[PDB]
Curated annotation (Swiss-Prot), chains A, B:
It catalyses: N-acetyl-D-glucosamine 6-phosphate + H2O = D-glucosamine 6-phosphate + acetate. The gene is nagA. NCBIfam families: nagA. This is N-acetylglucosamine-6-phosphate deacetylase. It comes from the Bacteria. The keyword Hydrolase applies. The lineage of its organism: Bacteria, Bacillati, Bacillota, Bacilli, Bacillales.
């Protein structure tokens, strides 16, 4: 169905239209205007009072949620994340693996390749943009909740095998540069236009600066599983903040880091160099309990997911809720929200021609939210994928 | 002598005049223009080729230099700092005390009061704007090079005595808020328009936020003698960076903190909320050796001043050299330099009506520097106080 969204504040690439209309046809945005379009629309949505139209949010680092985990390596896994992610305003994602035995990683990559290729559920809900390979090529000293017994130095031929198994779907790799001899895998990823994200790394600042020259461009979940900031040895944390060649992922749940630490990331990076993620695992959107994550038991109580030794282990964060917290932490604009939840991700993935802004020609991936970032309605490639309690 | 500076790039409050003239009469700036003034001038200075006219730099945290230390409590002490500070582009300063026996602090404060009052050397060189009382009301856990045996909790009646002894000259106090029961002294300083600078403090973020409400507004030498940044407990370092109610002093020598840490301070604070200082002690501008500082022996080798246990102990930094490093660390503008070396200090001390910008009506405190921040000439309240190797 062609679709028209009526009388809403629209957050475009560069501005906020106070009251506008967006028309959608054959999956794409065909009209963005202050005035009702002439053309007829099959369904029309009358937007609630103080609502805001944002570009659909893009989560580049997310393991699971709603009982599912990428590592499970079934079609059901992705039917579920696909189906349910629109409820937190997410319209596309990178299914994220974890450090694990290489054959477990192979199964997850092949599953995703085949599920996307099936073109069944992969046409509906949040679009599987590909894979974020998180580990195993990380530091034994910054494992966090990555299974320690499966951590191994970078292996370019094994990755090459993984990327063939993935049918080219791997878009980002998280790795520790100091565990990558000669920046071999970093140099390989740069060659292949796969983002090299520095994470779970105990590297010093000098080495990170050299990695950026070899092609590193992202930092994985800023503050988490990183060598700390010392004012005379800034480590991963200080380089991620002060080095303008890195885009920084951030988990804005107010648990992975303090509100002032989230605010510092926004001050230091600016709204064009920061990408909110959930890093969520399978207990997101379920109840208290114990859940598998990377072969370990994670005990979820309240908003905190912990290993038995109290190590934080993924999040329980919904994407829209991250937006709300960042607005509280920094008083940023709706424009900045669109940036740090959608636009920056799209640009970094090289898909800004089709995602990441409310703009004519792009996929009609959109979220209607309240002034408080509650999700009201989500559209995915032109189909309504979620409608909240405010139906009618 | 009335004075005219000819054909120079001038850094005003809000702009850089590419080629201008500044005329000076009876100690004040009387003309700032792109065109040669009509009025006759007794001496005229022809500025060298790529030079820049900056407002004279203001150092709000400096113990000594050139063999002298505030704590020495002689007229010679201030004759020397007064006389010699213009060589690093400094035209006004706060002589800074240290943690020490209360009678040693009394002597330093009375000396300064009497030396300023004498109006002899106090009319020439860098102007003694008053005193920065650094300690003793600091943390035993963040003493750094402050003499540990003299550290004591805040005492409002003893300060009140000190300020009477100082003839009202105390403009800033460095103190640890957690050692100030009920924020009593902080509340007192706010009442008296004396800056309360948080420093040598092991406080957490919550407490610092409450101190700012009680009236705390500065942070003493950002990164040094501070509880570290942890991403979930930001401490003094993270609050100083992310809390917009604090102006942050910074020692830009590339030794007290790493270049990326200096750059982070500039990203997080912006150029209106950061104040370069030297924190220099008596060995500044002398040779390698051992020197007294706060009753301890400081071994100066190269650019590093250390206690016998390797603790950093004041700096050997010249003010203009701090400007040069910050330009290297951040690529900031000449305008930003004027801010972080002069304007912000003046505004914070409540003396922007007379210092801190190249502006008609203000004291003629000015520094001519090269494109690399080498000092060429310094004027103090209208008198030439330093002329380098480029005479003629
Ligand atoms: N998925 C990662 C974990 O692996 C890590 O343990 C956690 C906390 O990291 P940190 O203790 O360094 O802040 O971040 C995320 O939750
Ligand atoms: N005058 C202070 C010292 O008291 C302190 O020891 C030093 C280093 O501080 P830190 O080791 O915390 O960086 O800063 C300045 O030099
Ligand atoms: Fe991780
Ligand atoms: Fe993760
Ligand atoms: Fe100090
Ligand atoms: Fe000091």
């Amino acid at each position: 169905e062609s679709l028209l969204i009526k009388d809403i504040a629209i957050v475009t690439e560069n501005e906020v239209i106070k009251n506008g209309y967006v028309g959608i046809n054959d999956g794409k945005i065909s009209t963005v205007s202050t005035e009702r379009p002439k053309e007829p629309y099959s369904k029309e949505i009358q937007a609630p009072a103080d609502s805001v139209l944002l570009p659909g949010m893009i989560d580049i680092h997310i393991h699971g949620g709603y009982g599912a985990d990428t590592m499970d390596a079934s079609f059901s896994t992705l039917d579920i994340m696909s189906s349910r992610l629109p409820e937190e305003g997410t319209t596309s994602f990178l299914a994220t693996t974890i450090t694990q035995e290489h054959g477990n990683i192979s199964q997850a990559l092949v599953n995703a390749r085949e599920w996307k290729a099936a073109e069944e559920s992969s046409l509906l809900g949040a679009e599987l943009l590909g894979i974020h390979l998180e580990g195993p090529f990380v530091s034994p000293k910054r494992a966090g909740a990555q299974p320690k017994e499966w951590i191994r130095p970078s292996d370019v031929e094994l990755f090459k095998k993984w990327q063939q198994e993935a049918g080219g779907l791997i878009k980002i790799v998280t790795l520790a540069p100091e565990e990558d001899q000669h920046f071999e895998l970093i140099r390989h990823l740069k060659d292949e236009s796969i983002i090299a994200s520095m994470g779970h790394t105990d590297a010093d600042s000098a080495l990170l600066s050299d990695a950026a020259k070899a092609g590193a461009s992202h930092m994985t979940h800023l503050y988490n599983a990183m060598s700390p900031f010392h004012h005379r040895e800034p480590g991963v944390i200080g380089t991620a903040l002060a080095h303008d060649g890195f885009v920084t992922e951030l988990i804005a749940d107010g648990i992975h880091s303090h509100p002032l630490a989230a605010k510092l990331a926004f001050l230091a990076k600016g709204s064009s160099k920061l990408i909110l993620i959930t890093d969520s695992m399978r207990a997101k959107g379920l109840k208290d309990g114990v859940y598998e994550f990377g072969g370990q038991s994670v005990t979820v109580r309240g908003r905190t997911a912990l290993l038995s030794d109290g190590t934080l282990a993924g999040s329980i964060l919904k994407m829209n809720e991250g937006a709300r917290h960042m607005r509280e932490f920094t008083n940023c604009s709706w424009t900045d929200i669109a940036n740090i939840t959608s636009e920056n991700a799209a640009k970094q993935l090289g898909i800004f021609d089709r995602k990441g802004s409310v703009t004519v020609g792009k996929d009609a991936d959109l979220v209607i939210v309240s002034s408080d970032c509650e999700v009201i309605l989500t559209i995915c490639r032109g189909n309504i994928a979620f409608i909240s309690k405010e139906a009618d």
